Design a binder for this molecule. Structure first.
Ligand SMILES: COc1cccc(NC(=O)N2CCC[C@H](C(N)=O)C2)c1Cl
Ligand SMILES: [Zn+2]
Length: 140
């Protein structure tokens, strides 16, 4: 579990969105595993606007933040889960690291701010849904 709180927005993995998130929907994209809902309180996270390929992510299954090198946002095949059939997920970045299902929502960050959130994992790999191209998160 986990979310990004920037301005009056809450950014969560679409497969973990609550009824309240769907009832206060701003934007959602199944192909990216993202959903954004509106909030009453202002958040403190800042979104990175950069092309960093190194950062640090939070792993709930180890209570630890790990430094990692990660690939550029791309279209990657993800195996069938209980939330999605086997499909191509877009705007996904891969890194070597520990990840279990419940690790989704963990923040990945660089020197400029929040880069994305854990979305996939498995066999010594961890996937992140990129948010740096969503410029509208910084306004309205
Ligand atoms: C023990 O680690 C494993 C082993 C096998 C599969 C997975 N689960 C995923 O990667 N997810 C599930 C949620 C939905 C994601 C998605 N964005 O499609 C995929 C993990 Cl983390
Ligand atoms: Zn950066």
């Amino acid at each position: 579990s986990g979310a990004i709180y920037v301005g009056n927005y809450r950014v969560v993995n679409r497969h973990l969105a609550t009824h309240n998130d769907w009832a206060n929907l701003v934007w959602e994209d199944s192909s990216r595993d993202l959903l954004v809902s509106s909030t009453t309180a202002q958040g403190c996270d800042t979104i990175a606007r950069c092309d960093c390929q190194t950062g640090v992510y939070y792993c709930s299954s180890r209570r630890k933040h790990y430094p990692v090198s990660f690939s550029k946002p791309s279209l990657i095949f993800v195996e069938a889960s209980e939330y999605y059939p086997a499909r191509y997920q877009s705007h996904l970045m891969l890194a070597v690291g520990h990840s279990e299902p419940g690790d989704c929502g963990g923040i990945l960050r660089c020197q400029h701010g929040v880069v994305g959130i854990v979305s996939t994992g498995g066999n010594g790999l961890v996937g992140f849904a990129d948010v740096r191209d969503l410029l509208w998160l910084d306004e309205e």
